[PDB]
Design a protein around this nucleic acid. Sequence first.
DNA 1: TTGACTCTCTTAA
DNA 2: GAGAGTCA
DNA 3: TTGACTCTCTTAA
DNA 4: GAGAGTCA
Lengths: 162, 162
Amino acid sequence: ALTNAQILAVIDSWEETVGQFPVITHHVPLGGGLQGTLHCYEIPLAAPYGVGFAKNGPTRWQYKRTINQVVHRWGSHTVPFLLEPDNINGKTCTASHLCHNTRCHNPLHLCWESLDDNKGRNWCPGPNGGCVHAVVCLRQGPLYGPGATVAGPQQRGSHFVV
Amino acid sequence: ALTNAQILAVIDSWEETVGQFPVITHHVPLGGGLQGTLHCYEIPLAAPYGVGFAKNGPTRWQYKRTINQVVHRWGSHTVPFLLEPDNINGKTCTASHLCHNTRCHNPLHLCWESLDDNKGRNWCPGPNGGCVHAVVCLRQGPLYGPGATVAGPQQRGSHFVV
DNA sequence: TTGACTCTCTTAA
DNA sequence: GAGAGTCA
DNA sequence: TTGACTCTCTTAA
DNA sequence: GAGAGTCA
Ligand SMILES: [Mn+2]
Ligand SMILES: [Mn+2]
Ligand SMILES: [Zn+2]
Ligand SMILES: [Zn+2]
Ligand SMILES: [Zn+2]
Ligand SMILES: [Zn+2]
């Protein structure tokens, strides 16, 4: 809610509940031929999810609390960042998974950044493969690699130059 | 159904028309601190665009030809690839700008690949900065860099480990 | 047959 | 990646 | 008050 | 990144 005290209380309640979510170990590519280990705190697949949590989409959840007799609700991954600016350079800040695991609610796996920065982590070579993200990636992005392009640049005639 | 010859005729008329678009010289980052030059063949900002072309959205156009009394229409950047497979790994192929300039219709600046491959080029370090795309990028992606993350991973208590 | 507009849709964060 | 409503 | 569902929306390719 | 309709 409005007060800093009320916001800290929301973060603390969220952390306590999420801290009881099952811890699932995931081994992940780091780039550079190296592998690391992440510990994701994963929300259950089906109800009940935990005090204050409810599913609004197959991979979307919301956290809700009643403060001053009013219900307040947030996207389930946005709660760690309730004291942060909600925009940057005129772009909305999003919760962004460094582990690329939507069910995970480990705040040590989340950052707060534009949707473009968020998306771009999908292709990052990773913390041992050349990641240049200022807030460093925890793993190589799942879509990093040569791609599967079907056809490259081409012309039939002689009208074009690169 | 249009024959191969008819499709080739469509590609040829498209190239003839696009080759007469204004050619704009752009200096671009290649990665590795190097700069290069790309020559984009840019569709006009407003009608008329060129024979067969019409705008269906702010940054969307279509190419239309009538053959044996039947109207055929294609996305304006898909025409170079009409003789190519239209899906790969169960994913639809998309026209993908290597120059990241939607107005450009230079077929030497286009490739044909999944939407994920397409998007990921936005963050590529570029052909002189470590590009691993099998069909190589022509330039560093416009969104490459450290990003502007507002808040990093953090916890208030001690409930979590990375 | 052609131009110049109109509308809505896909994907995965 | 999001917000908000309907029921019990 | 809390839980478990429902729906549609945003963005930029 | 897409497909399709209307009107003259
Ligand atoms: Mn993400
Ligand atoms: Mn693109
Ligand atoms: Zn995680
Ligand atoms: Zn990174
Ligand atoms: Zn171009
Ligand atoms: Zn590349």
